[PDB]
Amino acid sequence: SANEFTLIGEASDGSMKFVYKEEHPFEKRRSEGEKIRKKYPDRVPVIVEKAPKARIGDLDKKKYLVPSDLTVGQFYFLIRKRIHLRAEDALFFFVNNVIPPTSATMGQLYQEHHEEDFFLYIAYSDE
Amino acid sequence: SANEFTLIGEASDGSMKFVYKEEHPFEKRRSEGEKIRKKYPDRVPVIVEKAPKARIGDLDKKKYLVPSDLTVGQFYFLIRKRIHLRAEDALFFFVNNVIPPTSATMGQLYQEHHEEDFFLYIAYSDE
Amino acid sequence: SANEFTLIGEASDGSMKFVYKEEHPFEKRRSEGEKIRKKYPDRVPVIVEKAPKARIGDLDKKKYLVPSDLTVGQFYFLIRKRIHLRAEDALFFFVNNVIPPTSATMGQLYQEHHEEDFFLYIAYSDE
């Protein structure tokens, strides 16, 4: 197909703003994250939000406390069941605009990417 | 959701006991694993068992001889077809209580994790 | 199952020949790949072909221009939708006969594996 290409996929705009951070002042989030990490050191606190452009279902709950040794892939299935995804619908997680390996553990992601309020922030989208 | 978290996922209990090892004495397993590795050096012998708590189907066969360059992900699909998983059901593999990368090859997992009887042991579960 | 193994999976024959290369002389491919990489440096040109033995659907288009920061896993879903895979059908990508990690980016694969005509070649199969 001479000079012909099919342009597919979109470069991430990196513009994911979490509503959680707009609705809860930093000092309140940090106090809470610090406390929950002290109380439950084998668990990590995670905020999960849908990317605004995503056309899949929203979550009822956004604050999760998950085992540090749980993988991304296990978390994927737990979240997918909560939004009732059509069988053929894709679901991707983004941490700081990057999709993590599905065998990474939630503790590993948290250690590397948690924010200064001691939460790990994950966005999800359908593309 | 003030002080509110949804607790999801379970920390692995690491208590996976393989029935294969309870039914076949170590020396018989080792003799067999040694022999099959000598005869078929480009293949690895694998014991696959369902985690007792898993509510998905059991396998008819547990002893597999697989190409060393086959990936975990290819193996996943071969095993999934054998238990007739509902489309939305999850399937996870565990080697020594850890989920391997799906692009790892069976030979790589075997080299790192085979037991002293020269078998690689994989447990599977739905969570 | 004494002396009994179930032999499953197939060792890759590494014999994937791309029709694209048989139909377009090297110098024409290189000129084009060089030009498109100069013009669109944040995108990578990819040739996608079905492995001849695969019993899944063929693609209408084989020449794609994809964002460098798109993952393999995102690309998987874009290609899967284009061939209308039955829900339970597997789809695997091979670059130089090896399945890449699904979290690798297309730019990372391109940097490591592009050919001298400046295209990245991906084969897909159902096993």
Author numbering:
A (entry chain A), B (entry chain A), C (entry chain A): -14 to 112
From the paper:
Phosphomimetic mutations of BECN1 at S93 and S96 increased the binding affinity 3-fold for GABARAP and GABARAPL1, 8-fold for LC3C and 5-fold for LC3A. Using phosphomimetic mutants of known phosphorylation sites preceding the BECN1 and PIK3C3 LIRs we revealed a marked increased affinity for binding of BECN1 to GABARAP, GABARAPL1 and LC3C with a striking increase in affinity of the phosphomimetic mutations at S244 and S249 for PIK3C3 of up to 19-fold. This implies that the LIR motifs of BECN1 and PIK3C3 might be regulated by phosphorylation.
The latter contains PIK3C3/VPS34, PIK3R4/VPS15, BECN1/Beclin 1 and ATG14 and phosphorylates phosphatidylinositol to generate phosphatidylinositol 3-phosphate (PtdIns3P). Two hydrophobic pockets, HP1 and HP2, in the Ubl domain of Atg8 ensure binding of the side chains of the φ and η residues of the core LIR.
